[PDB]
Design a protein around this ligand. Structure first.
Ligand code: ATP
Ligand code: ATP
Ligand code: CL
Ligand code: CL
Ligand code: CL
Ligand code: CL
Ligand code: MG
Ligand code: MG
Lengths: 733, 733
């Protein structure tokens, strides 16, 4: 596949300089105030999207579980026990069918949105991730998927749903059109989505700080923190005013909350955790890492099977697959609820199914409750679940969650991984207490650590995940046990495979820049990875050359260079080359006054010109005849160049009949005169640091005599390319 | 004053390349494991330093208040009430005298350490901030200053005390000698100090992320977070095992904890805060900003008075000043305790002085308790303090804290600013309740917001302060009220002046690089700020030229250049210039094979050589005679060059008699061949961004023909220089 990076790096040219001269400090303050308003609006809209999802998910789940429960009672008294299953199947197969049609409409909405937000914040531009139809096909697709009982989550796709809003809202005010601002706003939207999904605004801010790992922008972080705070306190304001009666109160954080981690007042010896518990937490982490590695291995194999045996099929398939998994999931839940469910002697939350009077089914209250409610029941209830029920539930949920992720419907992954771990932690707590007396500590701490050591095993996130979990638990004393079970569960799994998001990004072939380069690649140099063969643009070039290079080549940036070694064209190029060069003595006096040889030729580097800018110049009548001076020019302003920003014209789309060939066009005023440059002797570590942190695109390599010697893009710094070049370097020596 | 920046930027030269070739992946993993161990040790040692301070501060305070309290009782029954004052004066004047002698020993330990940590993390190297004697003169100076009742704090100097440990411990293992690692370790130590002082490891991590605003280091942040977690959970483990009996439990976080913010179970209408409270919080923020601005104005005037009327005096003064302020702040406390104190009918915390039976003195229990205890009493305890007592206490504490900061003793500023705000918040809560009924909300929320809106007024920190306060309160629902009163209390104060740390850094004249440049300076270019006159080093230069440039000039880096336009020296320079250049066709074929004018001259840029490297080469016999080939050379290895890292020899210290002049020395193998470079057309925004984030030093400016036209350092990007050059630019046009 072919992917195109973002134009994050600022291009300062003559129209931008005119706008700069016009602007003053008061206009800057007004623009910054408008930016604050837009950030607040993005946060509020993400909170509202989360509210819309949450309200209707439960409005449908309650209806579906209130139509079957009476059917369960009557068909159980009659002994038929078949009408309820049929009604549940009808509900699930209708909801999943509606959720899969909405993904046939927009295929990018499939799965968790996080793999497509790790890429946009990296600057890769997955072709359809920030348009409104994707938001409609994901928000409406989730509430028909999780309401159909597919063992999926809602807080996963919330990051993508917030990212879409952050991309859309700032665009209406031409000052917000550039990608330099769009990437900042999508980072703010992702932070807001994380905050609204987990109730951890600091966690969302740190999630946005990496995955977009650029220079520390103090002021952008202070805005993406306010966006997350506004997102998590707008969802809270409405969700604590609809469920309860009090409106002004803020009684419950975002969609996934853990609860209150306090021990009973009766036991003074009881503590949340003690120094002895840390040894148990280290083993829980290394077991969770192995379980997450098994999960990732199985899901990677399943995805490899699907990408070759299901995707290359008519659109009728990828709907039958989702219906099949929904039918299997419903039948397994219902059968494991009537049978293998332990009726225990005894609330609105608790569910009584297939059990006698004054008795409840632990498996039924596990499965028929919403996943967020089941997490609370596994955190803060003791003695409700027997160890056999917990083991069977863990096995079934683990297998079905592994088999479900990858199908067309907009699935999530945080909750189904945060809920198997809760079962594992509760099970190990139950077996520990019976085996040897450990009643001096809270029992829900083991469930929390089991959930954390499974998230760390599956998604393998750090910093962001640690802060998200700590802020979700609302207990700072869990700072150390969580972190030391997130850095072990990762270190255990890294031996086997990468995180699931990395797995599902690598299957598509998306070119990503890793967190940092290795030392062996630091042994490599910039000359080895660069591209010597160049497609260049002369200043004062002709229209024929421009259309030829635009049609022939797919590159999006061309260096503007002059030969180091038509008559009007040559004269203008020589004049520009002479005028541009600024000698040291000239600067001091200004201050005081106050074949293959032909193909590869010495070319003095002058700037970079984008394909978009060249096409914009071609569409307009920006050209001067050789007879007249180069001073004559339509001289497009900055607004005129930015009018057509979101979608630029394709060169094949232009008629090209009106354009007179052999007419000179001046690209000097519109090029980027001084982009970042690296010497051929710079090592790959410095090049990678510049490319990643500056967010730049098309880094040129220029030698010590000012001659451009190569070009470098994202495809040159990708991991497999560096591995191949390092292997070739070892082979040469 | 003259300050020298850090050598943060990596220098990759031939000895480094040899070490790189020797090293493999297993050695890299072992080195990373050792780095993890060193980070853990830094965290543990910072926690132990905090424990040492905390234990002895209370051990001295309890003795000092147990010697007077009895004496107060008997001298009050007799009516003398004079012996207790003499005992208190003796204790205070002895402790302050001992605290001021330890600062006469090490003058840098004076005041809060934060202004000296904002500079080192900026890369300015205040001359004595990371040596062991400073740690001894600050840790031991604090426990004799706060124990003497000077209205100072302990949590301020803890950041500097952790920074010193982080600077000292990694140096014993030559791999940790470079400043590239020292700055990382001092950032980790500062994060650990913040965590141990406030119990907010995430707050310390974010405090270290800025003030060192560089490229996003994923892996370094994950280490400075673990360092802070280890620091705050080692202090906790000992402080909850010494005060209590249980050792394994973690019952109390670092030195300054707020408590538990829960409302009484009796009132259901009661909440921590509600939506209508936000209007009151906004006004509390704008009042706290004005109070902080008044504090800053008064303290700046006092400091400007002291720096010209007290500092240029014999060392006998600056001790009499501290004794005078201690004598005043003892008499004021004692008099405001017997008089102006309301004896109210009624615990170990509560303090009774100058009151009849079954009564307590509210002012006396405010003053005679430790500041951390007074904060708790002002937060979670209602009805104890009358509004008159609170107003008088706020006025007295505000004035004496403003007058105390700046004297020689190691004062702090967080607690004395976090404690006036608590009094203001409690006062406004008491006034509001009597004025109109607002019993539907918690009363300690107003105290918390008043403290936050005074910290925001005084120190004017963001992001870091917000997270520190949120994690200290142990309540995530306080995220929004706190943030919206830190962004207002700052926005109100910015109209008047800057924070205490900015003021007290600017008074010394330390060159700092701001968070970002303004748009008006973005109008400016790199040619305007650069330095055209250059002191350069030829490759294969003679000893005489090197000693001349080293003695004549104070610059610490010299460009290695060759003239663009002895016979052996000229021949070697020409050969090097010819061999170094790599043309584009050469790269392709290698892949396929597999007066004023004399002073300012065209010079092709080849690299940068540090003064330290030149002095190291001069000290050894690194030189070859013109008769013999340049290939002959002692060829110092990496370890030999790094043997003398912390303190480099001064050129005047060398005898220079042994060194034979007119012997050629080749500096090519040891220079930095490919540093970061900027074109003269680059604007000041990009130049500042590169300089600040890459942490680099001596950025060279090279034109389009490879000729170096200028040099840029920290002094060129400082705010005053940019303002002057922008004013000149406006004058020219
Ligand atoms: N103007 C250019 N002239 C020659 N080679 C180029 C040019 N631009 C990029 N390359 C090289 O071509 C290869 C990939 O080119 P590609 O068509 O993917 O670039 P692009 O579409 O402009 O970039 P991106 O995918 O990052 O948006 C890389 O090796 C890159 O260094
Ligand atoms: N090698 C050099 N040749 C000429 N000018 C220089 C050189 N190095 C620095 N300068 C300029 O001299 C001025 C200040 O020089 P200074 O003596 O403070 O530098 P330094 O001590 O090497 O740097 P630093 O203070 O950042 O450690 C600045 O304008 C800077 O651009
Ligand atoms: Cl989720
Ligand atoms: Cl997910
Ligand atoms: Cl402090
Ligand atoms: Cl301080
Ligand atoms: Mg492309
Ligand atoms: Mg200097």
């Amino acid at each position: 596949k072919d992917y195109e990076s973002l134009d994050y790096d600022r291009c300062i040219n003559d129209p931008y300089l005119e706008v700069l001269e016009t602007m003053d400090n008061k206009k800057g303050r007004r623009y910054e105030a408008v930016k604050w308003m837009v950030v607040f609006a993005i946060g509020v809209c993400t909170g509202l999207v989360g509210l819309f999802v949450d309200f209707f998910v439960r409005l449908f789940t309650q209806l579906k579980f209130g139509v079957v429960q009476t059917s369960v009672e009557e068909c159980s008294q009659k002994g038929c026990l078949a009408l309820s299953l049929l009604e549940l199947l009808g509900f699930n197969l209708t909801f999943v069918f509606l959720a899969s049609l909405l993904v046939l409409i927009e295929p990018v909405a499939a799965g968790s949105g996080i793999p497509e937000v790790k890429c946009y914040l990296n600057g890769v531009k997955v072709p359809g991730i920030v348009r409104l139809r994707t938001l409609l096909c994901k928000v409406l697709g989730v509430l028909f998927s999780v309401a159909g009982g597919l063992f999926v989550e809602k807080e996963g796709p919330m990051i993508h749903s917030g990212s879409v809003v952050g991309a859309g809202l700032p665009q209406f005010f031409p000052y917000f059109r550039s990608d330099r601002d769009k990437r900042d706003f999508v980072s703010a939207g992702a932070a807001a989505g994380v905050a609204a999904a987990f109730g951890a605004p600091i966690g969302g801010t740190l999630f946005s700080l990496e995955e977009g790992s650029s220079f520390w922008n103090q002021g952008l972080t202070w805005k993406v923190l306010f966006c997350s705070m506004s997102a998590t306190f707008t969802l809270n304001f409405f969700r604590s005013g609809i469920q309860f009666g009090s409106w002004g109160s803020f009684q419950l954080p975002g969609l996934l909350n853990f609860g209150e981690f306090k021990c009973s007042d009766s036991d003074k010896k009881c503590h949340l955790w003690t120094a002895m518990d840390l040894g148990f937490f280290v083993v829980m982490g290394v077991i969770g890492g192995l379980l997450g590695a098994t999960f990732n291995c199985l899901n990677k194999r399943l995805a490899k099977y699907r990408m070759r045996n299901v995707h290359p099929k008519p659109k009728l398939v990828r709907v039958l697959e989702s219906l099949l998994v929904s039918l299997v999931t419903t039948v397994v839940v219902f059968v494991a609820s009537m049978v293998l469910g332990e009726c225990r002697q005894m609330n609105s939350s608790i569910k009584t199914f297939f059990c006698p009077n004054d008795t409840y089914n632990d498996m039924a209250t596990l499965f028929f409750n919403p996943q967020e409610s089941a997490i609370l029941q596994l955190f803060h209830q003791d003695g409700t679940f027997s160890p056999v029920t917990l083991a069977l539930f863990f096995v079934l949920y683990f297998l079905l969650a592994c088999w479900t992720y990858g199908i067309s419907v907009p699935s999530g992954l945080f909750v189904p991984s945060l809920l198997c771990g809760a079962a594992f932690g509760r099970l190990v707590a139950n077996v520990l207490k019976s085996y040897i007396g450990l009643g001096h500590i809270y029992s829900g701490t083991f469930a929390l650590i089991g959930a954390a050591a499974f998230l760390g095993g599956v998604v393998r996130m750090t910093i962001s995940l640690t802060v998200i979990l700590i802020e979700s638990t609302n207990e700072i004393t869990y700072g150390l046990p969580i972190m030391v079970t997130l850095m072990v569960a990762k270190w255990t799994g890294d031996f086997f495979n990468k995180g699931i998001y990395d797995i599902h990004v690598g299957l598509r072939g998306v070119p990503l820049l890793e967190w940092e380069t290795e030392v062996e690649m630091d042994k490599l140099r910039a000359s080895d990875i660069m591209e010597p063969n160049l497609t260049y643009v002369y200043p004062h070039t002709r229209i024929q050359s421009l259309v030829s290079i635009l049609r022939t080549t797919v590159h999006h940036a061309f260096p503007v260079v002059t030969e180091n070694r038509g008559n009007q064209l040559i004269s203008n190029n020589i004049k520009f080359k002479k005028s541009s060069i600024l000698t040291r003595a000239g600067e001091q006096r200004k201050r005081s006054q106050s074949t293959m040889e032909e193909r590869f030729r010495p070319l003095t580097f002058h700037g970079l010109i984008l394909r978009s800018q060249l096409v914009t110049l071609l569409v307009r009548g920006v050209c001067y005849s050789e007879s007249q001076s180069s001073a004559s020019q339509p001289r497009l302003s900055y607004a005129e160049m930015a009018e057509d920003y979101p979608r630029y014209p394709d060169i094949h789309d232009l008629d090209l009949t009106l354009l007179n060939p052999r007419m000179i066009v001046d690209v000097t005023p519109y090029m980027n005169p001084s982009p970042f440059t690296v010497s051929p002797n710079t090592h790959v570590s410095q090049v990678f640091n510049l490319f990643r942190t500056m967010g730049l695109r098309h880094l040129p390599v220029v030698n010590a005599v000012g001659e451009i010697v190569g070009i470098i893009t994202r495809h040159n710094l990708t991991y497999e390319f560096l591995q191949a070049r390092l292997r070739q370097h070892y082979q040469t020596i």
